[PDB]
Design a binder for this molecule. Structure first.
Ligand SMILES: C[N+](C)(C)CCOP(=O)([O-])OP(=O)(O)OC[C@H]1O[C@@H](n2ccc(N)nc2=O)[C@H](O)[C@@H]1O
Ligand SMILES: C[N+](C)(C)CCOP(=O)([O-])OP(=O)(O)OC[C@H]1O[C@@H](n2ccc(N)nc2=O)[C@H](O)[C@@H]1O
Lengths: 205, 204
């Protein structure tokens, strides 16, 4: 079992007498020595941290026999810009992921698009996300180049769970509930369907 | 690290050739030889599983040098009955806890009140929860009897976070957003009463 949370990128002592060398799917799947695990990077908002996230993170932890899971979490600032609102701000979301079971390391304030230097800095061998193209402004897929590098490792999305769902579950209930106490309208019953959807647009795609 | 989730209670084998024998704070804090960890029970709804929960569990895991953390998760039925609603469904919250870092095994469909024979089958050495007396049912504290056995290990609530808080953030903005679009009166005065009432349904 684990008694303590996951190290932030900062806490950890890293060595540049160690050159940057990735591994190959074959070399990684044959499985790595204990001193040299495979290093994988998964990224996201992780708003309303839930099972869908955690399973993806488990998928990611298990890609190879010996693996080190690092997880980039984006800032509120970057997220509100390119995506929509978070219900929970970055610190809560930083704390959340630290408590996940398969998480070795947390990377704060992580970049929307990944750069050669980020990958070199954090010594990343592969990258874990779902195989849908991510369109964030200017790009049809922001993982395209990581895919092309052969660096990309796809994952599977859990069904029935998502941050939109958790929001729509609540909002749907309050909508009818508020209006009910107002009675104690007709256009609302019509626009209720219209309002809720629009509301969740603000939270992304 | 850990590549796999937490077992459930049933999913694991248990050998009853071992009689039920608890352990004192003393020889527990002295530390427990490997094959005999200390077994601690923490319980809750874990609706909207969050970091207040997760750290609560971390303390629980850390109460002793060698500690086995069992965590019970109460049913929708029990919860809707004795507490209020859950936006998360019992099967969802069963899954949530599985992915927590400090949790060795999960116990589905937990009791609202803990019983001698429940503590017997799960071989529970101690119990971790906050020291605020828990009043539901007719009990003004449901842990009092567990307290009195000296079997209780308190924990500390995190702050700024709780399952009720995540509701109000989401809720609030929508109360004002809807009304805003609505114009396309007097709701403002009552608005605070509304939200408050809405969160009463999920508990205190
Ligand atoms: C901004 N990026 C593109 C750099 C990082 C990706 O941003 P994002 O919006 O995909 O982050 P997110 O928090 O929505 O998703 C985190 C990860 O959890 C996975 N996920 C999410 C929800 C869900 N029900 N099942 C999942 O498997 C997604 O595939 C993703 O790989
Ligand atoms: C009903 N019981 C007593 C049988 C089980 C306990 O029910 P509960 O209402 O305490 O469950 P809950 O989900 O509200 O709390 C779960 C656990 O997380 C901890 N917790 C929760 C929120 C928070 N901000 N800080 C915390 O430390 C609580 O101490 C509790 O131990």
């Amino acid at each position: 079992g684990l008694r303590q949370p996951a190290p932030f990128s900062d806490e950890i002592e890293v060595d540049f007498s160690k050159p940057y060398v990735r591994v190959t799917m074959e070399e990684a799947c044959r499985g790595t020595p204990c001193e040299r695990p495979v290093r994988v990077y998964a990224d996201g908002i992780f708003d309303l941290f839930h099972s869908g996230h955690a399973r993806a993170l488990m998928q990611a932890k298990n890609l190879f026999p010996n693996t080190y899971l690092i997880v980039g979490v984006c800032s509120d600032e970057l997220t509100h810009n390119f995506k929509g609102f978070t219900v929970m701000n970055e610190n809560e979301r930083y704390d959340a992921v630290q408590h996940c079971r398969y998480v070795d390391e947390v990377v704060r304030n992580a970049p929307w698009t990944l750069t050669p230097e980020f990958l070199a800095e954090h010594r990343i061998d592969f990258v874990a996300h779902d195989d849908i193209p991510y369109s964030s402004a200017g790009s049809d897929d922001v993982y395209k180049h990581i895919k092309e590098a052969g660096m990309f490792a796809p994952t599977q999305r859990t069904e029935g769970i998502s941050t939109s769902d958790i929001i729509t579950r609540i909002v749907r209930d309050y909508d009818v509930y508020a209006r009910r106490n107002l009675q104690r309208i007709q256009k609302w019953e019509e626009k209720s369907r219209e309002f809720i959807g629009s509301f969740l647009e603000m939270f992304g795609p």
